[PDB]
Specification:
Distance between the termini of chain C: 62 Å
Largest interface: A-E, 62 and 40 residues
Helix content of chain D: 25-40%
Shape of chain C: elongated
Number of strands of chain C: 4
Chains: A mainly beta (338), B alpha/beta (218), C mainly alpha (302), D mainly alpha (21), E mainly alpha (53), F mainly beta (231)
Number of helices of chain D: 1
Subcellular location (chain C): Cell membrane
Oligomer: heterohexamer
Protein name (chain C): Endothelin receptor type B
Structural class of chain D: mainly alpha
Number of strands of chain D: 0
Strand content of chain C: under 5%
Radius of gyration of chain D: 8 Å
Largest sheet of chain D: none
Main location (chain C): membrane
Shape of chain D: flat
Number of domains of chain C: 1
Function (chain C): Non-specific receptor for endothelin 1, 2, and 3. Mediates its action by association with G proteins that activate a phosphatidylinositol-calcium second messenger system.
Protein name (chain D): Endothelin-1
CATH class of chain C: Mainly Alpha
Number of helices of chain C: 9
């Protein structure tokens, strides 16, 4: 009787596949050749932020596009002033094993999660003048990939429990829990409209969920290894994944398919962190060969190289202003590339 | 130039930087050990000697160096996705029990795990400190059981000393490099602090070797 | 009293010395060049010895570049067509290059001994606290102790019975009385500060290093123990002939000895060999790093 | 190189042929 | 047996989605990219007047 | 949080006295500290300042050398010891906390104050000193400067303080535009170099007091004469 359900499952998978192929009538490569490429992109280092004495594993900008919080493995996450390279704050962590550090869009809070299965929320603007822990969001049973803020009261986390949860700062329990991934989810990206989010796991599959409802609407496949990074396209209708095959594939939410792969034979290492630009024409990528790449999100040809780091770039993010790009690698240095 | 508030903001950052380096130099004078091993392979007993939901960090001190141990093999998770977090550790403490050589393939699983982590890209230079636990019961069970059961292509006398020597050399041959990475062997001698003295000596050795390598003299 | 006067440098001596000095010059500059290139790549292993090796290599490059070219030209023209200020400056920088070299060797010795005797600040990769003090102290002591040569040398054209000389000599008569006191026994102070002190301090520090230092663990304890001692032996062996020549020409030079003409000629021969060995000692340190550490071994092999 | 006087034509010749040191 | 029931239910739920033509999506991606291209400080470099760094 | 000072009393001219302020409820080491002198009838005047860790000390030119300040961070106390007092030092002294980073609000909290009786700067001028108002009416208060307070980084360092009759003044707006935390949104502020204004919308009770404009571009920090509201 179970084989009948298996037969139905593969039949539905086949019918979805051919419907997906039928809707596929062209490729992005055959049309972007019509429009001229930008050419060569030079990313000169502007700010080097030398405060950490251990490898950093994540960083995040603020919506102000000037403050950025970076968390390293030395046990302290630092709030930086990009324009003047100043340490606004230094928050000692209760566990040095930290994988992520988010920033509230209002700038009031900073979150942090790691191998302790807790995303602890810190309060910045306080009466006493010292950064204090607001909440500890335990109850995940698995190491934490990344926390992301919706508001000052809602946060979405993706842990090694092979699940994603929507917490509530004032209460402390996860109101909505997203499940369906098989392996541990290693990345999460929030759509600009803040209504859907895409998570990347070890299943080599990326799927998006209805934040309001709580279940996935569709799941994309095609990757060969674990997806280490996912970032949304600024228009909110696409996202570019990142695996250990050095391929930054790009998918469509409305077309429910994949537009174009970003494969270069010179790179066979892993991808650590991908991102887009404010316009979305060029997508950056953080590779495992100590240097950062700058692709072309429409033409799929490398439009530059950002190679100022002597170690693998563990994270990179672009200001919503669009001016600078912060790349933080294991040499404990944050470098700003305008 | 800079205004009054900008000047005071810079002074605040420099004060933060001083405290960061102060805590940084304090943490540098401290040795981190990645403890792991098979289930009930002496880890539950090693922590009781080296103490007095993802990371169980055991904190204790000795003559000096303020050893720190992060028990990671007890929790049940994936294999090698957080293994990059522990790169740069001073040493790895592998606890392999000799009483699992007859229980069913546990000895094979421990040896394969040893081979996987000894040749790993991250731990190319980090030393591994062995701990062969349950020595007395190992002698009793090899008295009650033969030795060729574990290894089909190996033959030898059924004595404690040759079996301990043969398993020790078998473990040490599992690595692909010998010049940079070093393996230190022991047998968890009784329950006193003699194990703590051994790990202190081994950690002292690897610190000296890496210090000379930094000086370009090794 | 006039001798026969066979005071000259052998044609075959020039033939061997010119090519040998050029080869030592080429090997020295390339070895120090790639050492500095490799050091600027060593940011993951940035430490005190990493800075000190660069300082020794840079001073080593300066010493060879300023010593070999002029000296090998002293075998062809032996007339010094250079300027008065250059004649007054080249000895000063040459002494400064020697000063920084020996002090950097001393600085290396103390650091490579504290590595095994002070395993309390066990780790920390970057720039050390008081090494910035030591490196500045080295570079200021060198010039402070070399400025006696800066104001001493001066061209004066004596009329030889057959030629018009162009000696760049330390003038016996000068203005300052302290300069006359200095040049009275300059060779002895040169011997002590540059040869004896760096030979005794480095040997003692490495002897302490071996005593504190002493399966594969003990074998590598002895391997480095013989390495530092062989390094000090190389330094003393190669730097001996220069100081020995100056001492011999100082006190063993007589006023009415018929053998003076032969003695001075062999003194010149010994002195040229001594400057060759001093340059050889300069090039030795890159070889020592290559033949000991596999990290530098593959760095050169890349 | 260093001589005692500027009249002894032996030391000055020796300083002529000596090395710069 | 229940896990297969859950997986097939999710797969059939994802099956009933009104997807659109890929050429339409590519055109929209191109349109958005070119429309906001002029205000991209990374794509088109900015002179040292709006440069904060 | 609260700042409580003590050690004020009548002295003879040429004498000495030391003023101590006790802090509690906040990280006292992370905050700079200011002393401000409020004359018996006149407006606010600045005295001295100590940075965090006592690394920087500034004084008003009228009390240079004569006064001296110190802090003991472990016991959360601030000191102001004065020697050879003049007859013009009879006033009320406040201890004001101020912490400086990006987005901070210096002079956020003011001490209660201690009485005391003895028997080239950027001049901040307020054209008016007393304007009658009624509840429910919008009133604009303007205060000028002898130099432009706009800096090259975009910050216009101008502050406004409201001293209700009976207690210490409090921060209303910092940098002339940013409302301080805990104040009603009815207040407002704008302006430019050498021309600043504060517009209050829908005036009500508990808003009556003397409004002081303070510049923080450079030390000493000159205050304004103050504009008093009446009903």
């Amino acid at each position: 009787e179970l084989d009948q359900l298996r037969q139905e499952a593969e039949q539905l998978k086949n019918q979805i596949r051919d419907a997906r192929k039928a809707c596929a009538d062209a490729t992005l490569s055959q049309i972007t050749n019509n429009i001229d490429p930008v050419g060569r992109i030079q990313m000169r280092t502007r700010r080097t932020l030398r405060g950490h004495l251990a490898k950093i594993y994540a960083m995040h900008w603020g919506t102000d596009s000037r403050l950025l919080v970076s968390a390293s493995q030395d046990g302290k996450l630092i709030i930086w002033d990009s324009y003047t390279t100043n340490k606004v704050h230094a928050i000692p962590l209760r566990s040095s094993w930290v994988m992520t550090c988010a920033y509230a869009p209002s700038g009031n809070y900073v979150a942090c999660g790691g191998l302790d299965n807790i995303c602890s929320i810190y309060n910045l603007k306080t009466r006493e003048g010292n950064v204090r822990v607001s909440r500890e969001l335990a109850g995940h049973t698995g190491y934490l990939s990344c926390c992301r803020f919706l508001d000052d009261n809602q946060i979405v986390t993706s842990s090694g429990d092979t699940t994603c949860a929507l917490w509530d700062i004032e209460t402390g329990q996860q109101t909505t829990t997203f499940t369906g991934h098989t392996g541990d989810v290693m990345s999460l990206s929030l759509a600009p409209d803040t209504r859907l989010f895409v998570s990347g796991a070890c299943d080599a599959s990326a799927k998006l969920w209805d934040v309001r409802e709580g279940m996935c609407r569709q799941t994309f496949t095609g990757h060969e290894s674990d997806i280490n990074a996912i970032c949304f396209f600024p228009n909110g209708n696409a996202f570019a994944t990142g695996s250990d095959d050095a391929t930054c594939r790009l998918f469509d939410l409305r077309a429910d398919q994949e537009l174009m792969t970003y494969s270069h034979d010179n790179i066979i290492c892993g991808i650590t962190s991908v991102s887009f630009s404010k316009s979305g024409r060029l997508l950056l990528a953080g590779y495992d060969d100590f240097n950062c790449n700058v692709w072309d999100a429409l033409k799929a040809d490398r439009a530059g190289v950002l190679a100022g780091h002597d170690n693998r770039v563990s994270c990179l993010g672009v200001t919503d202003d669009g001016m600078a790009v912060a790349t933080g690698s294991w040499d404990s240095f944050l470098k700003i590339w305008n | 130039t800079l205004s009054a508030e900008d000047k005071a903001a810079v002074e605040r950052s420099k004060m933060i930087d001083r405290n960061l380096r102060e805590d940084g130099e304090k943490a540098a004078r401290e040795v981190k050990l990645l403890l792991l091993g098979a289930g009930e392979s002496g880890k539950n007993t090693i922590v009781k000697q080296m103490k007095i939901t993802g990371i169980v960090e055991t904190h204790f001190t000795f003559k000096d160096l303020h050893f720190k141990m992060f028990d990671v093999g007890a929790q049940r998770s994936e294999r090698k996705k957080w293994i990059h977090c522990f790169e740069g550790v001073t040493a790895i403490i592998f606890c392999v029990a000799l009483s699992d050589y007859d229980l069913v393939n546990r000895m094979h699983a421990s040896m394969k795990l040893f081979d996987s982590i000894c040749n790993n890209k991250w731990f190319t230079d980090t030393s591994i400190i062995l701990f062969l636990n349950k020595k007395d019961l190992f002698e009793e069970k090899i008295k009650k059981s033969p030795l060729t059961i574990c290894y089909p292509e190996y033959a030898g006398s059924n004595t404690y000393e040759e079996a301990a020597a043969y398993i020790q050399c078998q473990f040490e041959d599992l690595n692909k490099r010998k010049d940079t990475k070093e393996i230190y062997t022991h047998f968890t001698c009784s329950t006193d602090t003699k194990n703590v003295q051994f790990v202190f000596d081994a950690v002292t050795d690897v610190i000296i070797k890496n210090n000379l390598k930094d000086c370009g003299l090794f | 009293p006039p001798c026969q006067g066979p005071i000259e440098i052998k044609e075959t001596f020039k033939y061997i010395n010119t090519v040998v000095s050029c080869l030592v010059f080429v090997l020295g500059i390339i070895g120090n060049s790639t050492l500095l290139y490799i050091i600027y790549k060593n940011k993951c292993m940035r430490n005190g010895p990493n800075i000190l090796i660069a300082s020794l290599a840079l001073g080593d490059l300066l010493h060879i570049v300023i010593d070999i070219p002029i000296n090998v030209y002293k075998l062809l023209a032996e007339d010094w067509p250079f300027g008065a200020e250059m004649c007054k400056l080249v000895p000063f920088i040459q002494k400064a290059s020697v000063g920084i070299t020996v002090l950097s060797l001393c600085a290396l010795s103390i650091d490579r001994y504290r590595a095994v005797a002070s395993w309390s600040r066990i780790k920390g990769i970057g720039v050390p606290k008081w090494t910035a003090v030591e490196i500045v102290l080295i570079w200021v002591v060198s010039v402070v102790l070399a400025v006696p040569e800066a104001i001493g040398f001066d061209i004066i054209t004596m009329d030889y019975k057959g030629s018009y000389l162009r000696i760049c000599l330390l003038h016996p008569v000068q203005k300052t009385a302290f300069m006359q006191f200095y040049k009275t026994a300059k060779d002895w102070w040169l011997f002590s500060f540059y040869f004896c002190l760096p030979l005794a301090i480095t040997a003692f520090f490495y002897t302490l290093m071996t005593c504190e230092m002493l399966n594969d663990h003990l074998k590598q304890r002895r391997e480095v123990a013989k390495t530092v001692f062989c390094l000090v032996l190389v330094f003393a062996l190669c730097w001996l002939p220069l100081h020995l020549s100056r001492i011999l020409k100082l006190t063993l030079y007589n006023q009415n000895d018929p053998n003076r003409c032969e003695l001075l000629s062999f003194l010149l021969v010994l002195d040229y060999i001594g400057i060759n060995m001093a340059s050889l000692n300069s090039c030795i340190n890159p070889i020592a790093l290559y033949l000991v550490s596999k990290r530098f071994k593959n760095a050169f092999k890349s | 190189c260093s001589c005692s006087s500027l009249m002894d034509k032996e030391c000055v010749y020796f300083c002529h042929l000596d090395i710069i040191w | 047996i229940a896990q297969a029931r859950k997986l097939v239910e999710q797969l059939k739920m994802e099956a009933n989605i009104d997807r659109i033509k890929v050429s339409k999506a590519a055109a929209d991606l191109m349109a958005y990219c070119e429309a906001h291209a002029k205000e991209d400080p990374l794509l088109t470099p900015v002179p040292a007047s709006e440069n904060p760094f | 949080v609260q700042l409580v000072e003590s050690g004020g009393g009548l002295v003879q001219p040429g004498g000495s006295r030391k003023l101590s302020c006790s802090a509690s409820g906040f990280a006292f080491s992370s905050f700079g500290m200011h002393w401000v002198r409020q004359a018996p009838e006149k407006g606010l005047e600045w005295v001295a300042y100590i940075s965090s860790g006592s690394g920087t000390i500034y004084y008003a030119d009228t009390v240079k050398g004569r006064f001296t300040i110190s802090r003991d961070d472990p016991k959360n106390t601030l000191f102001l010891q004065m020697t050879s007092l003049r007859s013009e030092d009879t006033a009320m002294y406040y201890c004001v906390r101020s912490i400086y980073y990006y987005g901070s609000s210096p002079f956020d909290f003011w001490g209660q104050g201690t009485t005391l009786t003895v028997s080239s700067d950027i001049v901040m001028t307020q054209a008016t000193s007393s304007v009658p108002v009624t509840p429910g009416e919008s009133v604009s208060i303007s205060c000028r400067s002898s130099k432009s307070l706009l800096h090259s980084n975009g910050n216009t360092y101008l502050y406004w303080f409201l001293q209700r009759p009976g207690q210490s003044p409090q921060l209303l707006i910092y940098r002339m535009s940013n409302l301080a935390s805990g104040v009603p949104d009815r207040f407002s502020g704008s302006g430019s170099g050498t021309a600043f204004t504060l517009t209050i919308s829908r005036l009500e009770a508990e808003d009556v007091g003397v409004y002081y404009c303070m510049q923080h571009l450079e030390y000493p920090l000159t205050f304004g004469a103050g504009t008093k509201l009446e009903l």
